[PDB]
Each structure stands twice: as structure tokens, then as C-alpha cells.
Amino acid sequence: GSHMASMKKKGSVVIVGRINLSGDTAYAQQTRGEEGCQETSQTGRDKNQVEGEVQIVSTATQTFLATSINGVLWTVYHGAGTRTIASPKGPVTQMYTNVDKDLVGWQAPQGSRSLTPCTCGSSDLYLVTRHADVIPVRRRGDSRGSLLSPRPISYLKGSAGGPLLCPAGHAVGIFRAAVSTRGVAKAVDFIPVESLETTMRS
Ligand SMILES: [Zn+2]
Numbered sequence: 681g682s683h684m685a686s687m688k689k690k691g692s693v694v695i696v697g698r699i700n701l702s703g704d705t706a707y708a709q710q711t712r713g714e715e716g717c718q719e720t721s722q723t724g725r726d727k728n729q730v731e732g733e734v735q736i737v738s739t740a741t742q743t744f745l746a747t748s749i750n751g752v753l754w755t756v757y758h759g760a761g762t763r764t765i766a767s768p769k770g771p772v773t774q775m776y777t778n779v780d781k782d783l784v785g786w787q788a789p790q791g792s793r794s795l796t797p798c799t800c801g802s803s804d805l806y807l808v809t810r811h812a813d814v815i816p817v818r819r820r821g822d823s824r825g826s827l828l829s830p831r832p833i834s835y836l837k838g839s840a841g842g843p844l845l846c847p848a849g850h851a852v853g854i855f856r857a858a859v860s861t862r863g864v865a866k867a868v869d870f871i872p873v874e875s876l877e878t879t880m881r882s
Contacts, residue, residue, distance in 0.1 A: 691721030692766040693755075695728065695789070696743065697736035699812045699842070701849075706812040708736065724764055724771030730791040734808060734842055739763065745810055745842035748794040749851045749873065750882055752776065752785040755841035756856060756871075760784050776879050782856050783871055783879065795843060797873045797882075798850035805852055807868060809839040817844060819852070822872055824859070830866045833858050844870050 694717050697710040711728055712720065717738050720726045735746045737755065746755035753765070757779050764771035765786045776785035788794060803819035813835075817825035825844065836858045844853045853870035860866070 690761070690763055691718075691740055692724040692764045692771050693737050693739055693746075693760050694720045694726060694766045695730060695735045695746075696738045698730075698732040699734040699736065699745070699808055699810070700732060701734065701808065702732070706808065706814050708810065708812045710736070720766045724766045725768070726766035727768050730789040731793070733793050733795050735792070736810060737765075737841070743810070743838050744840045745808075745838070745855075747841060747843045747851070747854055748788045748792045749797060749843075749854075749876060750880060751788045751794055752876070752880060753788045753792065754783065754785045754854055754876060756854070757782045757784050758857075759840055765789075778879065781871055781875055781879070783854070783876070785876075785879075795845070795849075795851035797877055798846040798848070798852045800846050800848060800850065802846045802848075802852075804847055806845045806847075807839070807855060808842050808845065809836060810842065817868060820867065823853070823856075824867055824869055826867045827865060830864055833860045833863055833865045836865050836868070844868075 696712045744759040805817040807815040816828045858865040
């Protein structure tokens, strides 16, 4: 049994900022502070204007990234779970949920812009972090790339759900997890865009 009257629900994922990639300079912009984030997570009602391809998103416990590709805002299951996302009309249910791929998605919010999936086959990639660093990554397999310059795992914490891009700025994948030893990240695991395309039926 249980005390049914006191049963709580997890809040929505809330967009709290974006990574601006539109000019020649990448930078993180915050669009909501912590108090507003908490309120918005509970109501699921977010009237803020959305712009851009890469959103900074938060739950009650974590902050990470989400990336629009082909009109779907994608992120990692390990960050978002099965949560709704806050929107101007209230909570929006996930359109895709795949724990096996560590992948979830919602319909892309009005005002967002989407990346296009890469078709170039290039192995020279670029990872965009939550701090708007653009880090060169050499692709090493279907789902892995090496950092040209290794760094402490702290640097990548909170970047899950962000994009890996080809030289032409098309989406190659979604960052999933760092590969590290003794706290040093030398590589990254990612969800390849073809996996998203198959999920979408595109
Ligand atoms: Zn490409």
C-alpha cells in the first residue's frame, strides 16, 4: 500500500538557455534563472521565445543539452528520462523514447531552427559543449571519436545531448558520454545521426 494523496510527479525538462552558433562566434546564452526554471518545471508552461539549434535544458537535478535535427529536439534518455518538456501550451510528451539508444525526442519547439543530417561521410568532426566550446574530434567508428586535445572530464559534464558536426556544419551525431581513464577524457561516445533518421522514418 501507499499514501496516494501525497504521490508526486517529476517535473518537466525546461529550456534554460541556448548555444548560439549563428555568427562566427559560439557562445552560451542563459534565458531563464534557477527560480524560474523550478517554477516552469512544475507547471510545464514555458512562454519564453525559443531560438537556435542547441538548447540548454534542465531537470531538478541536472543540466545538459538538446539539439534540433529535422524538426525534432533530441537529447539523452539518461538526462531526460521519459519527462515531458515545458512549452507555451503546457507539458509536451516525448515523440520518441529509446532507452536502448539513450535517446529521446520531442517535437521541435516553435522558433527553434534544425540542423540537417550530414551526408558527406567526413571523419573530421566538431563537438559543441554546453559552454559553447567547439572541440575538434576525429571520428573513430560509427559511435566514437577521439579528442585531438584530451582534457578533464569536468569539461564535458553537462554536454550530453549536444551535437557533433561535420566540416560543413551538418549533424553527425548527438554526444552521449565521455570515454575516460583516471578522470581524463580522450574520446567521446555519440549517437550517430543515422540512428535518429531511422527512428524518425526519414
Ligand atoms: Zn557533412
